[PDB]
Structure 1
Amino acid sequence: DTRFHSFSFYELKNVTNNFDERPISVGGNKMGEGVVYKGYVNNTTVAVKKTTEELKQQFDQEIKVMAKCQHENLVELLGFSSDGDDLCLVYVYMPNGSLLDRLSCLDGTPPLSWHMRCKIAQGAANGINFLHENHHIHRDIKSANILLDEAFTAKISDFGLARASETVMTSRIVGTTAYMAPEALRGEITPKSDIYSFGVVLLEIITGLPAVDEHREPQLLLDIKEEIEDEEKTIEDYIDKKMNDADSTSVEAMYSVASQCLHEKKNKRPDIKKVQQLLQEMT
């Protein structure tokens, strides 16, 4: 609780069109999914995220993480509400949405250049580096959770699952399957799992493809690593065509980082410091 604003529930209900759960593109306030709503408070646009006792301690858990973790490449928590029998968290609004939607060019946005993509990748790595340095594991690293501010600065978001480290195991396996390391899928909690997930992200950046596509072969993006290793295909075959500034050398350099991140065995993966350095040298 490092000087966050305490909101009453009615204030946030007011500014969100009464928590209008319809997508924004269809006239509502939902920008994603608790559920996350767009709101206008005090000349500012904000992001409002809306067992009883156990939801309360997760609510308290995230505030704890957000109090301790402040960084240019992390979404900043602005405040909260806990009086309308319905818990809310209020964050800095990121106008350019998620990396996922920018890679897909959702709603007709311009394809991201290779230069911008490298900057976002570096930003994301810097954000993850801060978390690991400060002994946190994100647990849900993915392109939908890399948000983009006014200047397309990468902002790591959705810390609802984040855990402090001192490898432990959990009974409640959480995360996004198409991004999850094998050990994470088996209930292990380790920062090495974040690295693996970041490798999938790097693949999405290179290819512009989503991590999963039920009508695609392979359905999982991470499987393209094996197709390339068993030289059936090249990374060149998979490079996003919606760029004109992607030189072979840096693309191959990024793929090399991605491939190392995606080692099936957690101990053979680079840590975030090495990932940071490698993305620097690519540039």
Structure 2
Amino acid sequence: MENFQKVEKIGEGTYGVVYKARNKLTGEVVALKKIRTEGVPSTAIREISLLKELNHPNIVKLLDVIHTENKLYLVFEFLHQDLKKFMDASALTGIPLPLIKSYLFQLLQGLAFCHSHRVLHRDLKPQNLLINTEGAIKLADFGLARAFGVPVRTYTHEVVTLWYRAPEILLGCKYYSTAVDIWSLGCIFAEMVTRRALFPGDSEIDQLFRIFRTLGTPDEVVWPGVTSMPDYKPSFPKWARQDFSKVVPPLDEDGRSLLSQMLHYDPNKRISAKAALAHPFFQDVTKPVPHLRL
């Protein structure tokens, strides 16, 4: 790019390559995402454009939408590190509980904001949760899923992670709700606590069965309507639910209680981000500074 002097390729996102770039007009460092294709839908341009107005301290700012040369670029504020790399970096010691709690609190504020504005993320994962040196954490890519579509890999063959996908999505429900983001965040919360992914499925069915083996195969009692879902099969094995005490030790009871509410099978029974912010788990929440190696 001419208006931007690439510093480095940050990696490959859901929709295309992402670079760390410098705006030659401002000297500002940003995250430039190329959106991988037969003209670029206008409905997309308009939708995405509306996202530029979404501002909240826990949402990565979408600075600009650039549609030129029949190519589409998204310009985002640049952040220091992603949660995935931070978790890997804290693997030996684990993230201190006060920081895990601060991050969860902030992420829920982010979701509460987006959800009140009717914007869903739909693909939350450690890779798109970004942190800075001051102890803030922000969600990147809210709303892109709806505006754009749903790719198999990314754009050039790249295994898309299914680890954080809500059960209703795996069972073929076509209408997503804000609850899919709460499910993903719950999975992320568990992963910060145990230092191991909660449901590391390697295929849609493996993903679904790992969920069932832990929370029990859902039925009409715990999830009214589940047996009528598009990809539900009466032949699904019937696994008993396991005790949460065994799932996220050594998380205390308030934490376990909150997580159970974020992982309810019925999307309608799953706790909302706003209600979760009032959960007693956050009664002693603070904002610690993390030890970031940049």
The equivalent position to 1:125 in structure 2, one of 63, 86, 108, is 108
**Which structure 2 residues correspond to residues 40-59 of structure 1 after superposition, within 5 A?**
40-41=22-23, 42-50=26-34, 51-59=37-45
Shift of 1:29: 2.0
Change beyond 3 A, Cα 1:56–1:149:
farther
CA distance in structure 1 between the partners assigned to 2:118 and 2:283 by the alignment:
25
Unaligned runs of 5+ residues in structure 2 are 153-159, 217-238, 286-294
The equivalent position to 1:100 in structure 2, one of 72, 84, 104, is 84
Shift of 1:230: 2.8
The equivalent position to 1:83 in structure 2, one of 62, 68, 80, is 68
CA distance in structure 2 between the partners assigned to 1:110 and 1:16 by the alignment:
35
The more displaced of 271-280 and 222-231 is: 222-231
Q: Which has the higher helix share?
A: 1
Task: Write the letter of the residue equivalent to 2:188.
Answer: V
C-alpha offsets along residues 25-75 of structure 1, whole Å, 9 cap, x if unaligned?
A: xxx4224412211112333221000133445533432221232x1100000
Check conservation: 1:212, 1:219, Cα contact below 8 A.
Answer: yes
The more displaced of 121-130 and 144-153 is: 144-153
Task: Write the letter of the residue equivalent to 2:162.
Answer: T
CA distance in structure 2 between the partners assigned to 1:264 and 1:125 by the alignment:
19
Is 1:203–2:190 an aligned residue pair?
yes
Check conservation: 1:58, 1:160, Cα contact below 8 A.
Answer: no
Greater RCO, 1 or 2 (C-alpha within 8 Å, sep 6+): 2
Unaligned runs of 5+ residues in structure 1 are 1-8, 18-27, 165-170, 240-247
**TM-score normalised to the size of structure 1?**
0.72
Change beyond 3 A, Cα 1:120–1:10:
same
Check conservation: 2:62, 2:76, Cα contact below 8 A.
Answer: yes
CA distance in structure 1 between the partners assigned to 2:283 and 2:145 by the alignment:
29
Change beyond 3 A, Cα 1:39–1:232:
closer
Partner of 1:152: 135
CA distance in structure 2 between the partners assigned to 1:29 and 1:273 by the alignment:
36
Per the alignment, in what secondary structure is the counterpart of residue 183 of structure 1? helix
Change beyond 3 A, Cα 1:114–1:228:
farther
CA distance in structure 2 between the partners assigned to 1:72 and 1:180 by the alignment:
25
Shift of 1:86: 2.1
Per the alignment, in what secondary structure is the counterpart of residue 144 of structure 2? coil
Tell me the percent identity. 25
